[PDB]
């Protein structure tokens, strides 16, 4: 937890949509971090790379979370985003909390914010 | 402290323990009124609690087969009514009223 937000992680991997539906479930959203605390609180919770709820699938290179609005802090792993292959919408938080971009389709831990 | 979040869609326990299980948290306990009124506050509908007299009947334990201590349940309950009810459900009003496991309902989910 940080201020008013709870975070809380997933056992299991799954692409984005499934891990959108989880959150959602509970009224929660997939986290967004909005400061460095922020980073570091979620970075805590998961054990393994997660996703967070920040994509560029609706304008390329514009990242925004999952209600439309764009991000302001990034912490992005050096050399990213590099949207490679076919491309990489999607975002996850590594192991040392640092960002990567990568396919949504692809499977990941996830962690849901509540408010 | 414990927090609490309710589920959009039904389902029965044995869902219900797989999702709130899903984000390393358990189906909602209430061990006091205080927490038996925040369950109300989040859950807009009859919603599961993590209670069943699963293992000999009438007597009740939380998901991890701890007696509780603190219930609240509705006037007439509980009843084990028909082929018999042993899961448990905090009505509208914050009583509780044993249900059939196999029936669906939202579910609370408890964190801390
Ligand atoms: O070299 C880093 C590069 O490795 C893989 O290709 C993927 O994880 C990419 O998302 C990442 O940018
Ligand atoms: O009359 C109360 C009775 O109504 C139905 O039969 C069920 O909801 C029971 O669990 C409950 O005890
Ligand atoms: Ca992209
Ligand atoms: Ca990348
Ligand atoms: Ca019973
Ligand atoms: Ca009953
Ligand atoms: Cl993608």
């Known amino acids: 937890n940080v201020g008013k937000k709870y975070f809380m992680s997933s056992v299991r991997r799954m692409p984005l949509n499934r891990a959108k539906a989880l959150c959602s479930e509970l009224q929660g959203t997939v986290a967004t971090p909005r400061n460095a605390e922020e980073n570091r609180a979620i970075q805590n919770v998961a054990k393994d790379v997660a996703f967070l709820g920040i994509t560029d699938q ?3 290179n514009v990242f925004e979370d999952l209600t439309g609005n764009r991000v302001r802090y990034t912490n992005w792993n050096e050399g990213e ?20 971009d990568v396919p949504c389709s692809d499977s990941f831990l996830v962690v849901c914010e509540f408010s």
């Open 81 to 100: 985003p590099n949207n490679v292959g076919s491309g990489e919408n999607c975002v996850v938080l590594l192991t040392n909390g640092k960002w990567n």
């Open 58 to 60: 609706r304008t390329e």
